[PDB]
Amino acid sequence: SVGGLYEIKIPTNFTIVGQEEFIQTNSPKVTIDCSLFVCSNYAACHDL
Amino acid sequence: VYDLSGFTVKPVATVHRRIPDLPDCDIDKWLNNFNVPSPLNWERKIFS
Numbered sequence: 748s749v750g751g752l753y754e755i756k757i758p759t760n761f762t763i764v765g766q767e768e769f770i771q772t773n774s775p776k777v778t779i780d781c782s783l784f785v786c787s788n789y790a791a792c793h794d795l
Numbered sequence: 796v797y798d799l800s801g802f803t804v805k806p807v808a809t810v811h812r813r814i815p816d817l818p819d820c821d822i823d824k825w826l827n828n829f830n831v832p833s834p835l836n837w838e839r840k841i842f843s
């Protein structure tokens with residue numbers, strides 16, 4: 748402080764800036780048929 | 796809402812392909828040949 752005063756940079760001009768922010772709120776609803784995935788069309792597999 | 800078990804469309808026809816007019820392999824004529832080798836000199840024949 749020079750005496751009671753401090754040096755500060757105060758803005759003399761300004762603009763407005765935009766900023767994007769994506770926030771995920773959802774996801775692809777994956778569904779699996781466990782029987783069709785594990786065994787496909789094969790009866791001998793569906794039995795086991 | 797119930798996701799039922801997966802179906803597959805039934806095949807409406809059968810496609811069967813084989814090369815026609817191929818000769819017989821004669822495997823019995825070679826196996827029944829009376830000049831039988833020993834295990835030391837075991838013989839091979841290739842059928843195609």
Ligand SMILES: *[C@@H]1O[C@H](CO)[C@@H](O)[C@H](O)[C@H]1NC(C)=O
Pocket residue numbers: 759760761
């Ligand atoms: C503020 O900044 C803009 C862009 O540089 C300029 O057009 C405008 O004249 C400036 N105004 C002042 C008061 O400096």
